[PDB]
C-alpha cells in the first residue's frame, strides 16, 4: 500500500530527470550533413542445399566462413568465395532457433525449443565434428546465444532470465532477473563487458556481466521486441518490434534519439544490423524484402527484394565488404 | 584452378549429394500439432517437446506436444492441428471457446485446417440424465434451442443428450463459419476415453485436406 506510492514517486523523478536533458534532437544537428543517396546492391552468390526455412545465421571472424541453421535438422558451414561446402552437422533436435560462431574459429553453438545449448568442436584429430558439452538449467526455450571466449557464453531464454555459463564445468555462475516477459535478443559489447537484452514486455535492459546487476531500463515500444543491435562505439542501441517501428537509444542520455517508421510498412521486424561505420542501418521485414535505413536521418536509402518469403536472418562481415540474408524459402544470398 | 580447389569441389559435391538424399525420407512423414488445456485428455486421444509416432495404412505420422504467442510461429508447415476440449465441465467451456477463437484467427495458421475433438461424452450424458445441473444455469440461450429435424442420433440414445451434444457442437462450429473464406475447414468429432477409431479419423481428414490442395492446384476450384 505504501510501496506503490514510493515506486510511482521514483518513476516520476526519473521521468523528470530524463526530460531535463532533451536540449536537442538528431533531426536538427544533421541538417548540415549530406544524404548518402541511392545505394544499389546486387546478388553475387546464391547458396543452395537447405530444404527448409532458415532461422539462424552468423558470420566468422575471417570474413569467409559462414554458418546457417534450418528446420531440416542440419547445420552447414559455407565458403562464401567459392560456394563450396566445408561441414554439415546433424542436430539432435530439429527445432533449432539460434546459432553462434566462436571468435577463435574452433567451436559453434546452437539451441532451440529443447531448452539446451549445445557446443560443437570443429577441430579434432579424428576429422569428425563431435559434441563437446550440453548446457542445461533453463526452464523455457532458448532464443539467443553469444560467445565471450572459449570458456564463457551468455544465453537468453523465454523464462524471463539470462545466464552466464562456464563451459569447462557446465555450471551457471550468474543469473540475470528482472524481466517480466520472454527474452528475445542479445547483443554483446565490443569490450566484452556489457550486454543488452530485449523482451516481450516492450522494455530493454543493460546488464553488468561482472556483477550480475541491471544498470538501466528503457521503455517506449508498444509490443514485443524481436531484435537488438549494437552501435560500434558501445554507447547506442538499435531495437526492432512487431509494431513496425525502430528506435535508437543512448546509454549516456538515457532516452530515445530517433524513430524509424513509414506509413506504408505494416509488418513486423525480424532482424537489425549495422555497417562498420554505423552510417547504414539494415532491417528485415515480413513484407518479403529488406530495407536500408540512414541512421542519422531516418530516411530510406535502398531495398533488397530477392526473396520469396519472410526474411529471418541478417548479418555483416567484420571487414564490411558483404551482407548475408536468409529467408524461409531455403536460400541464402550474399550482397555487395 | 589448383588441385586442392578441385578436391574441395568434389567434397562439396559429395556433401550436396548427401543433403539431397536425406530430404527424400523427410517428405514421407506427415506432421501434426497437438494443443489443448488441462483435464482435456490430450495424452489419450491416440493411445521441452513430447513426441509420438504411429502409422496407419503405410502412412507415417509424427505428432508434437509443446509443454504460445511466439513458439507457434514455427508450426506453420504442419498438415493439421488437433484441439481437444472437455465437454463435461460447463464452468470452463467459455475458456475453451476463447482459446479456439484465438487459435482459429491466428495470422500464422491461416492455411491450416483444424481437427476438433470433443471428449468425454459419457460423463456429459450421465450428468444430463442425473439432472443435478442444468446448462441454462450458464447458457441462457439453450432453453430456446430445439433439436434439428436432420439430426441422426445413435439408436438407443435418449433424446436429451443429443440436444446438449448438438448445442455444444453448434457453439463450437459457429466460430469456424464466421471467418476463413474457404481457406481452411474444421472437422468436429465426438470421442471418449475408450474409443480406438480415432486413428482413422486423422488419416481420413488428412487425405481430404491433401485432395483439396490438389484440386486447388489444377485450377478446378
Amino acid at each position, epitope marked *: 500500500d505504501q510501496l506503490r506510492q514510493e515506486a510511482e514517486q521514483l518513476k516520476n523523478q526519473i521521468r523528470d530527470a530524463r526530460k531535463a536533458c532533451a536540449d536537442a534532437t538528431l533531426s536538427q544537428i544533421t541538417n548540415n550533413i549530406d544524404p548518402v543517396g541511392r545505394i544499389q546492391m546486387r546478388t553475387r552468390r546464391t547458396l543452395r542445399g537447405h530444404l527448409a526455412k532458415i532461422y539462424a545465421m552468423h558470420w566468422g571472424t575471417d570474413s*569467409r*566462413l559462414l554458418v546457417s541453421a534450418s528446420q531440416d535438422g542440419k547445420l552447414i558451414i559455407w*565458403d562464401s568465395y567459392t560456394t*563450396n561446402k*566445408v561441414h554439415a552437422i546433424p542436430l539432435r533436435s530439429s527445432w533449432v532457433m539460434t546459432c553462434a560462431y566462436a571468435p577463435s574459429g574452433n567451436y559453434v553453438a546452437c539451441g532451440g525449443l529443447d531448452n539446451i545449448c549445445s557446443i560443437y568442436n570443429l577441430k579434432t*584429430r*579424428e*576429422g*569428425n565434428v563431435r559434441v563437446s558439452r550440453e548446457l542445461a538449467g533453463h526452464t523455457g526455450y532458448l532464443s539467443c546465444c553469444r560467445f565471450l571466449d572459449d570458456n564463457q557464453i551468455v544465453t537468453s531464454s523465454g523464462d524471463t532470465t539470462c545466464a552466464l555459463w562456464d563451459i569447462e564445468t557446465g555450471q551457471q555462475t550468474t543469473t540475470f532477473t528482472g524481466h517480466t516477459g520472454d527474452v528475445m535478443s542479445l547483443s554483446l559489447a565490443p569490450d566484452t563487458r556489457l550486454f543488452v537484452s530485449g523482451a516481450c514486455d516492450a522494455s530493454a535492459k543493460l546488464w553488468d556481466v561482472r556483477e550480475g546487476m541491471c544498470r538501466q531500463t528503457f521503455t517506449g515500444h508498444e509490443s514485443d521486441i524481436n531484435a537488438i543491435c549494437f552501435f560500434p562505439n558501445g554507447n547506442a542501441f538499435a531495437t526492432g518490434s512487431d509494431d513496425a517501428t525502430c528506435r535508437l537509444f543512448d546509454l549516456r542520455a538515457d532516452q530515445e534519439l530517433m524513430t524509424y517508421s513509414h506509413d506504408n510498412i505494416i509488418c513486423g521486424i525480424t532482424s537489425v544490423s549495422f555497417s562498420k561505420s554505423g552510417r547504414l542501418l539494415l532491417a528485415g521485414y515480413d513484407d518479403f524484402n529488406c530495407n536500408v535505413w540512414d541512421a542519422l536521418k531516418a530516411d530510406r536509402a535502398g531495398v533488397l527484394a530477392g526473396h520469396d518469403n519472410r526474411v529471418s536472418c541478417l548479418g555483416v562481415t567484420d571487414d564490411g565488404m558483404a551482407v548475408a540474408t536468409g529467408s524461409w524459402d531455403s536460400f541464402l544470398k550474399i550482397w555487395n | *584452378v*589448383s*588441385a*586442392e*580447389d*578441385k*578436391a*574441395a569441389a*568434389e*567434397r562439396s559435391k*559429395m556433401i550436396d549429394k548427401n543433403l539431397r538424399e536425406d530430404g527424400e525420407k523427410a517428405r514421407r512423414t506427415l506432421r501434426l500439432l497437438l494443443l489443448g488445456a488441462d483435464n482435456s485428455g490430450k495424452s489419450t486421444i491416440v493411445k521441452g517437446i513430447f513426441e509420438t509416432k504411429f502409422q496407419v495404412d503405410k502412412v507415417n505420422f509424427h505428432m508434437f506436444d509443446v509443454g504460445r504467442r511466439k513458439w507457434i510461429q514455427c508450426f506453420n508447415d504442419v498438415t493439421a492441428i488437433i484441439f481437444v476440449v472437455d465437454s463435461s465441465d460447463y464452468n470452463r467451456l467459455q475458456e475453451a471457446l476463447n482459446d479456439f477463437k484465438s487459435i482459429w484467427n491466428n495470422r500464422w495458421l491461416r492455411t491450416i485446417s483444424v481437427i476438433l475433438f470433443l471428449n468425454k461424452q459419457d460423463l456429459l450424458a450421465e450428468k444430463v440424465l442425473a439432472g443435478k445441473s442444468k446448462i441454462e444455469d450458464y447458457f441462457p440461450e439453450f432453453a430456446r434451442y430445439t433439436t434439428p429435424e436432420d439430426a441422426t442420433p445413435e439408436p438407443g440414445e435418449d433424446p436429451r443428450v443429443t440436444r446438449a451434444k448438438y448445442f455444444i457442437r453448434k457453439e463450437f462450429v459457429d466460430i469456424s463459419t464466421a471467418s476463413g473464406d474457404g481457406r481452411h475447414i474444421c472437422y468436429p468429432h465426438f470421442t471418449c476415453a475408450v474409443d480406438t477409431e480415432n486413428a482413422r479419423r486423422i488419416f481420413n481428414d488428412c487425405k481430404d485436406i491433401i485432395l483439396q490442395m490438389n484440386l486447388r492446384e489444377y485450377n478446378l476450384v
Partner: single-chain antibody, 230 residues
Framework: VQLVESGGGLVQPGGSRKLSCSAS????????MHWVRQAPEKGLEWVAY????????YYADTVKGRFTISRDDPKNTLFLQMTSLRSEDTAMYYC??????????????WGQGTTLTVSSDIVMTQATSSVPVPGESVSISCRSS???????????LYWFLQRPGQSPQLLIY???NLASGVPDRFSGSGSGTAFTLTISRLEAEDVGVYYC?????????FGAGTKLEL
C-alpha cells in the same frame, strides 16, 4: 590415428605382389590417401593418389600401366597392385593421409612402411650435403624451377623432417603455417622461387634430413634433402 602397412618381401623380376594398409582411429571414408616411395639413395618419390570418394585417380609417369590402386571403405583398407616389377622398384613404401578443404593440413600423418626387394615437371633444387652444427641458429634453403605462387594467394610448399629410424613428420604447410604438435622454434618464409627454413634453437631431437615438396601440379616432386649433423 594409426596407420599400419603390410606385405612386402623378396620377389623375382617379372613377378607381382599386392600391398595392403590398415587404417584405424579416424573417419577413413573422409580422407584421401597417397603412396610415396623412398629408395636408399634416391629420396622420396610419389607413386599414386586416390580420392576419398574414388572419383579421381592419378599415377606417376614411371608407373602407368603397371600399378593399380584401390580403396575399401567398409573394411578401412587400402590396396596397391603391382605387376611386371623391375629392379628400380626396390624401395620403402609409405602410406599418407590427406584431406582437402579450406584451412586443412593435407600431409599431417605418415605411416611406418614396408620393404620390397627385387632380385614440364617442376624441378625442386637443394644444394647442401651436410651442415655441421646446440643453441645455434640453422637456416636451410630450397629453390624451385617455376613459381609456386597461385593467383588465389596461396603458395604450395611443404616441409618434412625425417629422424633416424622414424617416418617423415610435417612441420610447415603453405610456407607459414605451423603444424599441430610442433614447438614454436620452427619458422619459414620466402617468396617466388626462393624459400628458407629457420630454427631458432637446436636440441638433440632436431637431427635429420629436411625435404621440400610442391603441390601445384601432378606429378608431385620432392627435393634432394639436406642433412643436419649435430
Amino acid at each position: 590415428v594409426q596407420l599400419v602397412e603390410s606385405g612386402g618381401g623378396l620377389v623375382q623380376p617379372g613377378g607381382s605382389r599386392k600391398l595392403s594398409c590398415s587404417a584405424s582411429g579416424f573417419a577413413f571414408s573422409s580422407f584421401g590417401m597417397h603412396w610415396v616411395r623412398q629408395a636408399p639413395e634416391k629420396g622420396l618419390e610419389w607413386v599414386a593418389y586416390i580420392s576419398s570418394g574414388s572419383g579421381t585417380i592419378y599415377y606417376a609417369d614411371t608407373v602407368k600401366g603397371r600399378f593399380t590402386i584401390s580403396r575399401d571403405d567398409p573394411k578401412n583398407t587400402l590396396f596397391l597392385q603391382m605387376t611386371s616389377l623391375r629392379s628400380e622398384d626396390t624401395a620403402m613404401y609409405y602410406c599418407v593421409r590427406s584431406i582437402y578443404y579450406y584451412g586443412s593440413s593435407p600431409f599431417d600423418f605418415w605411416g611406418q612402411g614396408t620393404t620390397l626387394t627385387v632380385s614440364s615437371d617442376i624441378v625442386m633444387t637443394q644444394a647442401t650435403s651436410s651442415v655441421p652444427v646446440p643453441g645455434e641458429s640453422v637456416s636451410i634453403s630450397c629453390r624451385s624451377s617455376k613459381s609456386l605462387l597461385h593467383s588465389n594467394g596461396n603458395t604450395y610448399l611443404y616441409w618434412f623432417l625425417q629422424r633416424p629410424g622414424q617416418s617423415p613428420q610435417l612441420l610447415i604447410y603453405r610456407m607459414s603455417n605451423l603444424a599441430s604438435g610442433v614447438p614454436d622454434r620452427f619458422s619459414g618464409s620466402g617468396s617466388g622461387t626462393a624459400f628458407t627454413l629457420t630454427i631458432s634453437r637446436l636440441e638433440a631431437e632436431d637431427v635429420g634430413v629436411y625435404y621440400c615438396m610442391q603441390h601445384l601440379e601432378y606429378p608431385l616432386t620432392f627435393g634432394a634433402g639436406t642433412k643436419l649433423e649435430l
